[PDB]
Amino acid sequence: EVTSTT
Amino acid sequence: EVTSTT
Amino acid sequence: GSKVVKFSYMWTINNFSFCREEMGEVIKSSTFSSNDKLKWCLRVNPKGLDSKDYLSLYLLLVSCPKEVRAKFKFSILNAKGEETKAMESQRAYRFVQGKDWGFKKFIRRGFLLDEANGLLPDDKLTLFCEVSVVQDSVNISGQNTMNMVKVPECRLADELGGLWENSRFTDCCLCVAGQEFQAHKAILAARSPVFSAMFEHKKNRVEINDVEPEVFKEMMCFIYTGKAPNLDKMADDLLAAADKYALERLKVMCEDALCSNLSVENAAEILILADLHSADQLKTQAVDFINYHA
Amino acid sequence: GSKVVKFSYMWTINNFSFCREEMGEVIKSSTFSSGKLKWCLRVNPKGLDSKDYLSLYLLLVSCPKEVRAKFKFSILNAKGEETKAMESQRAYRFVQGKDWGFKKFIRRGFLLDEANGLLPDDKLTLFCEVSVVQDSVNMVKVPECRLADELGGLWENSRFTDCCLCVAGQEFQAHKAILAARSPVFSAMFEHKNRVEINDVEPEVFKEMMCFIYTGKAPNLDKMADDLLAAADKYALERLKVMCEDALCSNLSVENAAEILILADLHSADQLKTQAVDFINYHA
Secondary structure (H helix, E strand, C coil): CCCCCC | CCCCCC | CEEEEEEEEEEECCCCCHHHCCCCEEEECCCEECHHHHHHHHEEEECCCCCCCCCEEEEEECCCCCCCECCCCCCCECCCCCEEEEEECCCCCEEECEEEEEEEEEEEEHHHCCCCHHHCHHHHHHEEEEEECCCCCCCEEECCCCCCCCCCCCCCHHHHHHHHHHCCCCCCEEEEEEEEEEHHHHHHHHHHHHHHHHCCCCCCEEEEEECCCCHHHHHHHHHHCCCCCCCHHHHHHHHHHHHCCCCHHHHHHHHHHHHCCCCCCCCHHHHHHHHHHCCCCHHHHHHHHHHHHH | CCCEEEEEEEEEECCCCHHHCCCCCCCCCCEEEEEEEEEEEEEECCCCCCEEEEEEEEEEEECCCCCEEEEEEEEECCCCCCEEEEEEECCCCCCCCEEEEEEEEEEEEHHHHHCCCCCCCCEEEEEEEEEEEECCCCCCCCCCHHHHHHHHHHHHHCCCCEEEEEEEEEEEECHHHHHHHCCHHHHCCCCCCCCCECCCCCCHHHHHHHHHHHCCCCCCHHHHHHHHHHHHHHHCCHHHHHHHHHHHCCCCCCCCCCHHHHHHHHCCCHHHHHHHHHHHHHCC
């Protein structure tokens, strides 16, 4: 599952 | 099948 | 590394079952490309070569600047524009000027001429070719550490930017269209052969009459940091400025941006700009773009 | 049509087990490119928040003002094959400073069990593959930034200098603006007659500190790390200080650890101390 900290 | 005329 | 270029071509052959081509006769399409210096075309033998009951389809590299690696896929489009009876190369084949690669037995005329399959609406044969040119690229990477110590990234440009932005310890004044800006001889002379010359031949007052204040601020920002945040909005003026003050890297950074905007509608305007400020790289790109859309 | 650029990046982190990074803390790798974008990887040894995992991300560090990209991370074993791969189901949109990745890339417990063999010699080797896709409807060679080298020339040739720095008798010519922009200690002096006396740094070490001040580099740091560490500290050049810490850290040996520890206490070199303390215990 792809996510972004920014 | 791949060929060349030459 | 690797770089793949994909492009395709549609070729409709009107009144197909009507064309007189006999066994051995070949009809070629118009040339097409992916700018790219390669020219390709499709070759079809309505009645094969050796065989008679099949269509022979080949991809042919017509022109190239002295070899190419390419994968390809051929198919037929139906009324709804969908692909059918596709046949593709397992791998990329090596091409040189005049060489072709394809399938001697692409599809049987019997299957093609059976209205039940609807591959010849209005007796028109639309062939579809998909091409993938592959080139090897060498990956580039930085050396990695072997210590648990995390070293902050260089911040030279940012700190120096604080000098221009907050006008600290300035020693000269740049007057642009009546407006005065504070700067530093040293830094301007270190980064601009032109400013260097001026502060070479009181001398703290320099008049600037070829650049607009808004563009000048952006240029000055590039002088202190090596960056131009707003280049996207004034790449054409910044190009001129960069050229007048001998800031080569900024010049090319603009050639780059102006190049990424080329369209059939502005290529001519841009070529003129490239000529006047001797933007070599932008000039070639523009010229080729113009020719490619001739 | 389409242009699709594929490239790879390999990243080995030594003594992974001993990475005292706590939840939230990050380790950043070196930058890499396909060969005008600049990428890099970020890892969270103890999760970004689920801290029983390693968080792995792909960051777009620099670029000319957006990029679509598919990515896949994995871990290489001794023979060099991939294991435990996680891949994006599609291409994600990147912009400068933007990142994408997997918060739960792999479970520490699994990574630490020697039965799986993902840490040969306690060295973690992460592999990253990227695929950038662009619409046809890169070809212009842009020079690398030469800011550091041109400002460096300003110091190396003493052009348009405006103040004099006397170091143990020797007179050096510099630029106040530059020194102040780069040193809080120097900024304090010029904020309160163009001649500054310095007697805490040796000439040779001074020339190198100045080289850092004008160019962000210090080519001779290795042969004077201890003295430069102290010089960096007295003139609040935090980054240079850390660069010397890294140089000293990789020199740790049973014979010098105690000395290096003392040194790190006196110059508040937090990272060097920790590394030294750890080096000494593992050898008690």
